[PDB]
Amino acid sequence: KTHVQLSLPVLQVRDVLVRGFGDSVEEVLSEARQHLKDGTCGLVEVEKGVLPQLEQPYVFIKRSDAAPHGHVMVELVAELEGIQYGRSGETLGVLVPHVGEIPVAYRKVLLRK
Ligand SMILES: O=C(O)[C@H](O)c1ccccc1
């Protein structure tokens, strides 16, 4: 399937133990996609002071369309040193590895895979 319904645990930035997916745009997009497949991906909602507490390159989920079965359609966009790889809509948050942190909420998304 081209899209997969996922429920992403929303984590507080100060709880996150592993603050990015790796060291290159290509690696972080690869690792994000793997963690989204394996159910080991969390979402941090972006506000003032969040991104400097996480590791670049960043992986964002961004709205790809204006929401089947409650699931917002999203795609992945990476960022390194102020350059974005991908073009998409509003940021829903930044993806990180999930290693057992307790979430504050779930974000229902339909991920373009
Ligand atoms: O196809 C799968 O195994 C799975 O749906 C999946 C989820 C997220 C990204 C890629 C693939």
UniProtKB/Swiss-Prot annotation:
Residues 1-113 are annotated as: Disordered. Residues 2-113 form the CoV Nsp1 globular domain. It is found in: Host cytoplasm. Signal peptide: none annotated. It comes from the Viruses. Inhibits host translation by associating with the open head conformation of the 40S subunit. The C-terminus binds to and obstructs ribosomal mRNA entry tunnel. Thereby inhibits antiviral response triggered by innate immunity or interferons. The nsp1-40S ribosome complex further induces an endonucleolytic cleavage near the 5'UTR of host mRNAs, targeting them for degradation. This inhibits the integrated stress response (ISR) in the infected cell by preventing EIF2S1/eIF2-alpha phosphorylation upstream of stress granule formation and depletes host G3BP1. This is Host translation inhibitor nsp1. It comes from Severe acute respiratory syndrome coronavirus 2. The gene is rep.
